[PDB]
Design an enzyme around this catalytic site. Structure first.
Site, PDB file in Angstrom:
ATOM      1  CG  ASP A   1      -2.203   0.818   0.978  1.00 13.47           C
ATOM      2  OD1 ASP A   1      -2.132   1.793   0.230  1.00 13.47           O
ATOM      3  OD2 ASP A   1      -3.237   0.457   1.537  1.00 13.47           O
ATOM      4  CG  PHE A   2       4.893   3.120   2.331  1.00 16.70           C
ATOM      5  CD1 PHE A   2       4.414   4.414   2.355  1.00 16.70           C
ATOM      6  CD2 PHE A   2       6.224   2.907   2.632  1.00 16.70           C
ATOM      7  CE1 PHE A   2       5.253   5.475   2.635  1.00 16.70           C
ATOM      8  CE2 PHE A   2       7.062   3.968   2.922  1.00 16.70           C
ATOM      9  CZ  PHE A   2       6.573   5.249   2.927  1.00 16.70           C
TER      10      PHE A   2
ATOM     11  CG  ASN B   1      -5.605   0.739   5.391  1.00 20.71           C
ATOM     12  OD1 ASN B   1      -4.867   1.725   5.396  1.00 20.71           O
ATOM     13  ND2 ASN B   1      -5.512  -0.230   6.292  1.00 20.71           N
TER      14      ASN B   1
END
Ligand SMILES: [Zn+2]
Ligand SMILES: [Zn+2]
Lengths: 273, 13, 274
Positions: free
Chosen positions: A34-35, A107
Site C-alpha cells: 500500500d505504501f 485503507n
C-alpha cells in the site's frame, strides 16, 4: 492505565461500544504494498508511465489525462488478490461479540469487509472498490462489474455512455464520503478508542483521536507514538508500542481469545481459498 | 480533503 | 551502475569542480540536536506546557502573536554555542576550503553550517537563521548577538524605539522563502555534482531541485534510505550511499583520502570552540 487493564475491560464487556481507527499499519503484514515504497513493489511499475510524482496517481486532472496508472494500482489491490491478517480478523471477532461500534479505516485494500466486517460497521474514509461511478454517466456500478476489464489490463467504460468508470476512491482534493460524518455520532458515544497502525499524519483523521470524552481510554498499538496521542496525551492513554501483529496477538492472549482466534483465522482462510 | 499532499508548506513565494 | 568509489575518484581527479549540496536534519542529529521535537526529549516536554494545538503551531505566525513564549523556548536551545557541528559540517567546510563548494542549500535552523566556518555567500539557509532579527513593528534589522541576552533569560526581546517583539529571521508557515533561495536558478544548471546529506525530500520546492541538475551530473544520496524524487525519478550516474549519515560521510572521506587532512580540521576548530 496498562494494556491488560484494557483487555480486562473488554473481556468483561465493560467496554461495550468500541470505535477503532486503523491505517496502512495493519495491512502491510498481509503483504499489501500500500505504501508504494522505493523498493520492489508497484513503484517501478508505475514509473513506466512516467508519473510526475508517486502521489500523482490519486489526482483527478492527471487521471483524466492518463488513467492507466491508477488502474494498474487497482488491479493489484482489487479484492480477491490479498488476504486479511490477524488484525483484520481480531476486529471481526470484536464485531461478532457485539463490542464493535464502528471501524474507521484509512485503507483502500478492502480487507476489512473480506475479514467479514459488514459495511454498516465500516467507514472506508479513502474509498473502496465495492462500487464505481461512471465519470460521464454518473451511474453507480458494483465492484465485480469492472473486474473483467480491470484484471485484463483494460480501462472500463460505462455501458450506455462508454465513459470511464472510476472506482469510488477519494482522489486528492475530493471531499471525504458522507459516511465520514458518522464521526459526530460515534466518537462521543464510544466506550473505548482503538488505534492500530496509523501514522496520524492526516489531520482530518487525526483530529478525531481527541473527539472521545476524557473518560474513554485510548489504546495505541502503533509502532511509534504519533499524532495527538503523542503530542497531547491523557491519563487513561495506553501505548502498546511495537510491531503491530505482536501487539494485537498479546491483546488477544490477554483477552483469553487465542483459542477462538486460531479457530476463526483457520475456517475463514478455508472460505477464501 | 483527504491527505492533501501540501498539508503544510512554507511558501517559496 | 555507479559506486561511491567511482564518485571519490572523480572528485580526486577534479572532474567535479563546482559542487552544490543539499542537507537536512539528517546531518544535525549526530550532533544531538532535536530539530524535530517528536521523540521524547527535554525540548519536547517543555513545549507541552504552553498547550499548543499541535507541534508545528510554534512555526505558524498567528499562534506566535497569541503567545510568543514557545518559539523563543525553541530558540533558547538552538542559539549558537549550545550544540557543536559534527563531521558532516566540517566535511563541507573542507569542501569549501578546497575551492569546490558552489552553494550549500540547508533546511536547518541550527546554524551549524556557518558555525563550522562556511561563509554566508557560499550558503543558502533556506528556512532562516537565528543570526539576525527584525522588529515586528518598525521592521528594523538587528544582528543575532543583539537579542542573545534576552533570549537566554527566558525574556521576549522588545526593540529600542518600537518596544515591539523582535522576531529572528525564521521562515514561519506561510512566510515566503528567503530571497537567497532564488540562487537555485543560477547554481543548479552550473553544478557538476549534487550531494544530498540526510534530507527526507518530502517537502518542496526542495525535492523539486533534485531534477534541476544536468543529466551528466551525478547525485549522491547518503541518506539512511532512498527518498524523494531520487526514488521516483533516478538517474544513471546517481549513487545512493544508504545507511547512517556519519558512516557514509566517513567512508567517502576515506575514499577521497582526506582523513589525515580531516582530523586536523576537527581538532583546530574544537579548540576555538571551547
Ligand atoms: Zn457512462
Ligand atoms: Zn521594535
Amino acid at each position: 492505565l496498562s494494556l491488560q487493564d484494557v483487555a480486562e475491560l473488554i473481556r468483561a464487556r465493560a467496554c461495550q461500544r468500541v470505535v477503532v481507527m486503523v491505517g496502512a499499519g495493519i495491512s502491510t503484514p498481509s503483504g499489501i504494498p500500500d505504501f508504494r515504497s522505493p523498493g520492489s513493489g508497484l513503484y517501478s511499475n508505475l514509473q513506466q508511465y512516467d508519473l510526475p510524482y508517486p502521489e500523482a496517481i490519486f489526482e483527478l486532472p492527471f487521471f483524466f489525462h492518463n488513467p492507466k496508472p491508477f488502474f494498474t494500482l487497482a488491479k493489484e489491490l482489487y479484492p480477491g488478490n490479498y488476504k486479511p491478517n490477524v488484525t483484520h480478523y481480531f476486529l471481526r471477532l470484536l464485531h461478532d461479540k457485539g463490542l464493535l461500534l464502528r471501524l474507521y479505516t484509512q485503507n483502500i485494500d478492502g480487507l476489512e469487509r473480506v475479514s467479514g466486517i459488514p459495511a454498516s460497521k465500516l467507514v472506508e474514509a479513502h474509498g473502496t472498490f465495492a462500487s464505481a461511478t461512471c465519470t460521464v454517466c454518473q451511474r453507480p456500478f458494483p465492484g465485480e462489474d469492472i473486474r473483467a476489464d480491470v484484471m485484463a489490463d483494460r480501462v472500463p467504460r460505462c455501458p450506455v455512455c462508454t465513459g470511464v468508470v472510476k472506482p469510488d476512491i477519494v482522489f486528492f482534493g475530493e471531499p471525504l464520503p458522507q459516511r465520514f460524518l458518522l464521526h459526530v455520532v460515534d466518537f462521543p458515544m464510544a466506550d473505548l478508542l482503538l488505534i492500530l497502525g496509523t501514522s496520524l499524519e492526516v489531520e482530518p483523521f487525526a483530529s478525531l483521536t481527541e473527539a472521545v470524552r476524557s473518560s474513554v481510554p485510548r489504546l495505541l498499538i502503533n509502532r511509534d507514538l504519533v499524532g495527538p496521542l503523542a503530542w497531547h496525551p491523557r491519563s487513561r492513554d495506553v501505548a502498546q508500542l511495537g510491531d503491530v501483529v505482536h501487539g494485537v496477538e498479546s491483546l488477544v492472549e490477554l483477552l483469553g481469545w487465542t483459542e477462538e482466534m486460531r479457530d476463526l483465522v483457520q475456517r475463514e482462510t478455508g472460505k477464501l481459498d | 480533503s483527504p491527505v492533501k499532499l501540501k498539508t503544510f508548506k512554507x511558501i517559496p513565494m
